[PDB]
Design a protein around this nucleic acid. Sequence first.
RNA 1: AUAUGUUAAGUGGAAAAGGAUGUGGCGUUGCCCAGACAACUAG
RNA 2: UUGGCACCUCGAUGUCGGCUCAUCGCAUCCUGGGGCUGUAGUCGGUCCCAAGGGUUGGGCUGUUCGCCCAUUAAAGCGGUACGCGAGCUGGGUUCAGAACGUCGUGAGACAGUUCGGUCCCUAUCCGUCGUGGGCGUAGGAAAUUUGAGAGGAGCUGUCCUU
RNA 3: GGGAUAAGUGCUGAAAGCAUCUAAGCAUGAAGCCCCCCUCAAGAUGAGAUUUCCCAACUUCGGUUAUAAGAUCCCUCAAAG
Lengths: 165, 145, 37, 58, 215
Amino acid sequence: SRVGKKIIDIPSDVTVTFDGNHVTVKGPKGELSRTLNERMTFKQEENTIEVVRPSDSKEDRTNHGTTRALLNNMVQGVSQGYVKVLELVGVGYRAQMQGKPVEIKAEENITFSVEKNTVVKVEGISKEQVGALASNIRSVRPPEPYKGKGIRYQGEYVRRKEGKT
Amino acid sequence: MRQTFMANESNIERKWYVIDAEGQTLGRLSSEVASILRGKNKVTYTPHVDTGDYVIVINASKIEFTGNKETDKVYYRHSNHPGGIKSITAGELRRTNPERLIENSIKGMLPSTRLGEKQGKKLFVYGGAEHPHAAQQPENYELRG
Amino acid sequence: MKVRPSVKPICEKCKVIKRKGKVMVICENPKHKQRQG
Amino acid sequence: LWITRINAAARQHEMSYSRLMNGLKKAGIDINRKMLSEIAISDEKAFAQLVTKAKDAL
Amino acid sequence: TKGILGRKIGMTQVFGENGELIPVTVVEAKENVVLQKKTVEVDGYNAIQVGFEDKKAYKKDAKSNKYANKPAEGHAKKADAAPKRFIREFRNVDVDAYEVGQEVSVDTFVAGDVIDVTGVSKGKGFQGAIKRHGQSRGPMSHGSHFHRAPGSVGMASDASRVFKGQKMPGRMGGNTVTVQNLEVVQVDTENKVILVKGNVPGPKKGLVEIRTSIK
RNA sequence: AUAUGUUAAGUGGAAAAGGAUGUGGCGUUGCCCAGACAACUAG
RNA sequence: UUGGCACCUCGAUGUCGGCUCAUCGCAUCCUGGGGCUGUAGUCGGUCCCAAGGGUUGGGCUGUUCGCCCAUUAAAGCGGUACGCGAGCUGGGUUCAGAACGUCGUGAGACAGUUCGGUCCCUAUCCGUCGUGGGCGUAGGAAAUUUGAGAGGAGCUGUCCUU
RNA sequence: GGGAUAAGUGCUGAAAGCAUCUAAGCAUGAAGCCCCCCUCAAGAUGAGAUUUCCCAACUUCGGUUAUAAGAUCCCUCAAAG
């Protein structure tokens, strides 16, 4: 909880439609229905964004500091588009058995049919969802320490060991 | 043995009440209901006879707790079998069969005697807001906090 | 991931925080990660 | 038993046994607990007056 | 789905494809007629009552469960059918593909269908602890006085009592058993019989219920 | 019940060396719209 | 665990190992998830989470002990009067007989070794496993709803397709 | 197979203008798990349960009457004991 309490809270040029319990921002490709907190109220007199800080307590000191940045990206994603560049190596290597009185459930040893194997760029409006999917597809092949084989961002460390548990 | 009025049969008048559990602490509510069931608010209260009235909880599924009591406060129960111990969190006991959660709570604040069991059979708990006792014409009863 | 009663920052690159009421040393190095308990 | 009855009868006038008892003592009344309860059970009108006197002595 | 009631006749063998021996159990099932249709807006659960064997109708002085009137008669008069001997219920079949008075034939099943047989067991009466449960006996010689008897039934001072279910001697037999994952070798409509691959529980001329295996 | 405070663990309703970005009190100083302190680029 | 104290039992709380039958724990032997390695792949050093089930036949020393043979996915550590003799054996410890060695003037002693040597009871109460009679629901016959209860759950080895 | 879950891996994100799995929130994840699923006995004096069908003169239904594939008693028996 070591973050600058003071927030810029810049105005939003995109169209905004607050319904009290739920706030939706519809613009070029926004319209992201989301329910915020009802503790601290807002002061959206016009395009300029604003939120009130009632009670003034430890819980209100953080609650008011979260909503401010919680709507910042909300309207930011209604006009802009968060995109991440994912680099990796395309091979398909996955386990070993060779081939793709009874076998372990019919056939065995199946890798993945390489279809893309190129720098993928996710295009979304919600950073939260964008991050999830981005990491969800980045978990397919965790960056191995051998030669960094597998979906990743940039971080990588050379290694070659796996003999002790 | 000078003179002391003693209540008995053909002298006791029992009425009906309808308490609402809308946003009320489990323990705080049960405590009040218990007294009414025993009839400790009557001027003709007698310990060797039943002079209490009938209570009817309407909501009960909107009952709330304090702190992390919905995650803790487990309810254990044995089945008289080697290793037959079952448990269930209060929060999970409020979603399914919430009427039993209030019953037990109010039944744990009554004496464990023959009269205590008969006095605990005058309590009716529900989950919605519609009770099938319109023939008894029960009136509302504000909780004297 | 060491689990000892005493947890102190080994270097200045390691920072200490509190997650789920537990003192942990979220350090950059993977061999410098400790958790009290 | 008497105390219990009095408490119930004294709670119908927005008051507590401890508060009522205190007031009565300050008023100067010397009625017994067995007599106070007996009155409340029967002549309830008479009991009402008693409470008023105790409420006037604060 | 696909329920029926039949009687256990005996046990024989049938040669299948590639000259492979297959032990089967002859089950005769005829005169199957629906008697009622339990709904969810009148009972709270969908089900259908089915009869099995027939019997004689109206009779006066009759001190035997075979032929009379009144109670059973009336209930069987509701639908166009005669008094039944056995009656059961099925809450696994659809209650929209049947009609009060329909005749459940043995054409509903087809060779290669997995079914689950259900029925009561034979009965050996009062049995010992070496037969009821798989227990071992003590030395038969070497100056031993412990043969087909049970051992200890508890510990000592601590918890000085016997825990529920100490596996002691008692009556063992009449129990409802249900064999799962069976098979229908071949179905005959001429004699209205079904050939199940294996052996169902119960003695000869006993009541058995068949149902399509869920798994 | 009244009046004022403390605690967020069910502490209350079991222990110690030690460990720790919990929190409230007291003190003693060092900077502060010449602009501290986040933010940040010169070797 | 070996001990310290001497509070219950000397008008008796009568027994070491094995046999039969069990329950409970977790400081985890096997199977399941993970983390980090001065962690080549296989494989395993350590650490964390996890108790549901499963945990072998023989030879021998007197056996609780231990050593060996051959297996197994594994042959885990404990608690319950060092679980269990009104359920079993009597090998051990063991009582009157008799040898050997040391000790004693001798009767004899030895936490020395050896052969032989009677283990009593018709279940009243609670408890447990089965099975009926009597009433009660304001019911004569069938067919049932059921979450209250019990049981069962995750072991191996090949085949064969990037 | 389904639902929450543990260690753990995360995604956003704030009471040091950075950071941070966290104080809100969104995920994922065990022979985990008692849950659900499967098998069996089961009306619960918290008199309870439910459905279908059958059964009337006495005589103020006092029971003077009584009826119901309504119960036995007794007799031939075994898929039961």
